[PDB]
Each structure stands twice: as C-alpha cells, then as structure tokens.
Amino acid sequence: QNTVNFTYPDFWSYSLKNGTEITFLGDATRIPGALQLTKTDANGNPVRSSAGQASYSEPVFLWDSTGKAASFYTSFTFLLKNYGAPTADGLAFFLAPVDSSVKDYGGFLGLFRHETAADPSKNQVVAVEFDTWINKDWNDPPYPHIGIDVNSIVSVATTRWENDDAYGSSIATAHITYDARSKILTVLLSYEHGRDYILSHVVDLAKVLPQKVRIGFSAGVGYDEVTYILSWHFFSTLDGTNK
Amino acid sequence: QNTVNFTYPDFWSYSLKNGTEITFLGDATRIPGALQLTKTDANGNPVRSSAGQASYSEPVFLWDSTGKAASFYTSFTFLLKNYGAPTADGLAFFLAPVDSSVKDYGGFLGLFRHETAADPSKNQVVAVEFDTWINKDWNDPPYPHIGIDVNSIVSVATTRWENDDAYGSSIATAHITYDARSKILTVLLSYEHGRDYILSHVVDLAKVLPQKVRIGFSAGVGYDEVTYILSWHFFSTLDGTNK
Ligand SMILES: *[C@@H]1O[C@H](CO)[C@@H](O[C@@H]2O[C@H](CO)[C@@H](O)[C@H](O)[C@H]2NC(C)=O)[C@H](O[C@@H]2O[C@@H](C)[C@@H](O)[C@@H](O)[C@@H]2O)[C@H]1NC(C)=O
Numbered sequence A, B: 001q002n003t004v005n006f007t008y009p010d011f012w013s014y015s016l017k018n019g020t021e022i023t024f025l026g027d028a029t030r031i032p033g034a035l036q037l038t039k040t041d042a043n044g045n046p047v048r049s050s051a052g053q054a055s056y057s058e059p060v061f062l063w064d065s066t067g068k069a070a071s072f073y074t075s076f077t078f079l080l081k082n083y084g085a086p087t088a089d090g091l092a093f094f095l096a097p098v099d100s101s102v103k104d105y106g107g108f109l110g111l112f113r114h115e116t117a118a119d120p121s122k123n124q125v126v127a128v129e130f131d132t133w134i135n136k137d138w139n140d141p142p143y144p145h146i147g148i149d150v151n152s153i154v155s156v157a158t159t160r161w162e163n164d165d166a167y168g169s170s171i172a173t174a175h176i177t178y179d180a181r182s183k184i185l186t187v188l189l190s191y192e193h194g195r196d197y198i199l200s201h202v203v204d205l206a207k208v209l210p211q212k213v214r215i216g217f218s219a220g221v222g223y224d225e226v227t228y229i230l231s232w233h234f235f236s237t238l239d240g241t242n243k
C-alpha cells in the first residue's frame, strides 16, 4: 500500500535494532523510554555542539506523477529538558529525501549545512521547528518560536513560543497535519494546563519534496538542553486525491 | 481581556444553571456526563426530527477594526451514538453571531432555515460539520463526510468520513484550529485505534463573521442517532496580530 500508520504510545521497549523501525543518526540515541536527539554526559547532562536525528526507517510515500498525494497527521510528545534559560538550539519535525542525513549542529538543527542554509535551491526539506534561540543571521524573530521551514532555515512563517514554555521543561504534545488537497500544513502545540500554539501555512509538498521521503526528528545544540521524544504516532491517507 | 481559555475534561458536574457557563437551546440538554444535543425518549433512544444547540455563554472575541484577530484552538470528544446504519443527520461545531439561535432540524443541523440554507448572503455562520447523511439537495458528496461550511450548508470543502467511523458509535476526538494570520481553518478527527481525518481550508473569519461570536455545538436529526459531547476545551490567542 501507499499509506503509513504507526503508533508508539511510549518508547519503554528500547530494545529494537537501529534501522529496523527507527534509524538513529549522529548523536541521537535510543534510551529506555525515549528517543534522545543530542548528546549527554554520564549524568543525562547535555553536551554542547551536537546534532542527531531519529527517523522512521521505511520510506514514506508523498505523491506520484499520477496526482495521488498523501495527506498526513503526526502527533508526538516530547520533553525539551532545559538547564537554565535561555538554552540553544531546539528541535524539528522534518520530511527530507530518503538518502539524506544529519547535518550541522547548533542553529541549523541537524538539518542544514552552514554554507547553503539560506539558499532554497540547495535544499529539499520541509520542517516544523521549535527554535529556542534567536539567530539574527537567519532572521529568527526576537523570541523562541515555532516555525515552518521550506528548503531553508529562514522560516516562511513563525509564531511566538513563550519563554516559560520554551525553557520550562514540561512535556508538550504536538500535532502536525498536512492536507494534500488544499496544500496546508498546520502545527498545534499544547501544554497540559497551559496554552496552545497554532501555526498554519500553505505549502505544496509535491512541489518541494520528492515522491517518497524519510520522516523524523532532528535536533541541534547549542547548550544546556536536550530533547527527548516520548511517543510518536503517524498516519497518512490518499483520500480525496482520486485514490 | 480579549481572549478565552476553558477546559471541561468531562461533564460529570451536570449541576450548573442553564446559561451560566453553557447555554442549551432547542432540544439540547445537560445530562450527567454529557451535553446531549437532540432529543431522546425515556430509554436514551433517539427521537426523530429534533434540533439542539449547546454553546458557550460568554461572547468570544474574534477580531476588531484595529486589526487584532484571534487565533484559536478547540478540542472535544464526542459520542455520536447510532441505532443502525445509516443514520441522520450529524452534528457541527460552529461560530455564529451572539444573538442567533437554533434553526431547522434534519440536514440543516440546527444551523440553517430551509428557505435560505443555500444562500451565503442570508447567513453568517462558520461551521465544521460531521454529516452522516447524503442530502443531494445541498450537494453533499456521496458518503458521510466532514465539511467546512461558510454561510451555507453547501460545504466549501469536504473529506470522506468512513461508514464504520460515521456509524460505528465509538468516542471520537476532534481538534479544530484557526490561524488568524494565515486565515486557515484545520479539522483533525481521531479514533483511538483507528484512522485520522484531516481537512483544512483557507477561510478569513473577519470577512464572514462579526467581531464577537457565540461558539458551540449544533445537531439536527433525522433518525436513529443522538450526539453526546463528553469534554470540551477552547483556547484563543491574539498572537502575531500586533497584540
Ligand atoms: C544506525 O544506522 C545507520 C545506517 O542506516 C547508521 O548511519 C550510518 O552510519 C555510518 C557509520 O557507522 C555512516 O557511514 C553512514 O553514512 C550512516 N548513514 C547515514 C544515513 O548517515 C547510524 O550511524 C550513526 O549515524 C551516522 C551518520 C554517524 O553519525 C554514526 O556515528 C552514528 O553511529 C546507526 N546508528 C548507530 C550506530 O547508532
């Protein structure tokens, strides 16, 4: 079939072989209960200048020449543990070509290399970033933000992420949806007894990504932080695109 | 303040006075544990030709002349109990003027009157419908569907809702988000060990609705069905619209 549907309610079954279900790249490791994205020393304390990626092993069908295009929805809970405020650099949910890998650390979030990050013609990646650091270089807005990145680290759209959420170290739940008929990407971020964050933008994936992609989480530090992914669900559907 | 934030995890505190927190119109009633939208006989069994609305009592600020516009997110779980398959007519989450009320039953979902339902100039309502009945009259697609209605019962966009979900009588969770900067409305519907449904569409609320609205649930039957709302959360934010 052309669609995907998986659900990991938690990651307490930390025993599967790298590359069978989830592939860990760079400094991303599987620990009991979580996908850890960047490096920590013996005490779980975050190491500076590190990048890692945890991505689903099977290729994910996005679109085909015949007009079939997948709509999708992914939800995940994560803990961006902070060791002070502010911290750097954040994490990202992404869709990239199957052959790609982790790139630069820090503000590039393991997704871009320094020399081509602001060039949309040299990159093929769509990402939803949870950026804890204002890099003026890449035109980050003057606060922690959530952003939608299309082929570049300069977001096509961002919304404010409050300091206390961004550096508060609480578990957060994210829902990211893509409607393939209207070409809309929506991000919803919720904190249990807190506020929600909404960011939606029109982006046609068929025009920016190959027909089949790898999906996953990418992180880049920075300092005083480490992101843990606690659960992951993904569902894609061809509904409404003639199949 | 101009924003709203409430959370009802369940409705087991069925004792609040009508109109203080939630207002019940028509045949919608408050029962232990749920907001019941249409009528049932002594045994909880659904009565035909009924309409009811359960809406939040305070007015909800949407936009103002000065450009401030509210982004929002609402989540709710509901049980559309079915007494066979197919059943009629569904339910809807809506945003309408503060002075409005419940309208016709059946395929109008308590939201429109028969004579002006297909006329966008005579209505001011934005609704997300979960339609269990194909009314060829109103150009419903040939299946249960989820639809986005703007000033008319003829949806500006729909996506397929599978028969087994539509008439399966399981609790479903819906997330509806509106981003006021990009004018995008997204609907996410999830079933626990099932599939998800994604429908997003560009709709500028400031151009179709008054500055302050009432929000709620509306239902219209039909036959062999009754909708129960089990929980409700709403959050609105002025973020990114200069306030
Ligand atoms: C998990 O499996 C991956 C293969 O699907 C490993 O990545 C590959 O590692 C090779 C070195 O062991 C490297 O030459 C390959 O290019 C790389 N594959 C990709 C797509 O980059 C992965 O190894 C980790 O990731 C690479 C990129 C390095 O940073 C290694 O240090 C990492 O170990 C495997 N994970 C492991 C061993 O944890």
Ligand SMILES: *[C@@H]1O[C@H](CO)[C@@H](O[C@@H]2O[C@H](CO)[C@@H](O)[C@H](O)[C@H]2NC(C)=O)[C@H](O[C@@H]2O[C@@H](C)[C@@H](O)[C@@H](O)[C@@H]2O)[C@H]1NC(C)=O
Binding pocket: B018, B019, B023, B024, B025, B026, B027, B099, B100, B101, B102
């Ligand atoms: C809950 O409070 C409402 C007032 O905020 C009631 O609605 C009002 O009911 C009047 C008749 O009792 C009617 O003249 C008003 O127009 C109506 N308000 C609106 C906005 O329509 C409501 O009454 C229910 O809803 C109305 C529309 C009728 O269908 C009544 O039969 C219902 O009782 C109150 N709910 C109750 C008493 O359950």
Ligand SMILES: [Ca+2]
Binding pocket: A089, A107, A131, A132, A133, A134, A135, A140
């Ligand atoms: Ca940054």
Ligand SMILES: [Ca+2]
Binding pocket: B089, B107, B131, B132, B133, B134, B135, B140
């Ligand atoms: Ca209908």
Ligand SMILES: [Mn+2]
Binding pocket: A129, A131, A140, A141, A145, A147, A153, A155
């Ligand atoms: Mn950024």
Ligand SMILES: [Mn+2]
Binding pocket: B129, B131, B140, B141, B145, B147, B153, B155
């Ligand atoms: Mn319909």
